Design a protein around this nucleic acid. Sequence first.
DNA 1: TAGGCCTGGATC
DNA 2: TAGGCCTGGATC
Length: 134
Amino acid sequence: AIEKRLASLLTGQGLAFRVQDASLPGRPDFVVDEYRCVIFTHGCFWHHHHCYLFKVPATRTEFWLEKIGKNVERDRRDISRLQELGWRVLIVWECALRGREKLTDEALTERLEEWICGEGASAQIDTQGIHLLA
DNA sequence: TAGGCCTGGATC
DNA sequence: TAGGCCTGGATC
Ligand SMILES: [Zn+2]
């Protein structure tokens, strides 16, 4: 749905990858054995991305803010386990794969490349670049 | 299909 | 992690 926009590039570089595995925490979306790393395509809302696509609903605010918080909490945990199992994690938010700021289809491959292969601490890819996971 | 709203939903 | 609605475009 958005997983594709990114998935399409993966095979674009051949990169050996499996999909949505429920045997790995946070059930990654893309799993790559070619580097012992997993990727995530998190929607900006459910996971509270401090990006333009995040808007606290005006209804049942407290019910959504608390539900969301538990999500972030679950990601933190998820990532942490993955890292424990010798996995490198990368998060690519939607705000940088769909929307009025979405990385030009170039910048991605160009950024995914320097990552996936050329090693590097876990990190996240957003509309304004890629930074250490944190 | 482009995004912009509005809510929960289905599962496990 | 949505799907249902509604707008406004590009493709044909
Ligand atoms: Zn975002």
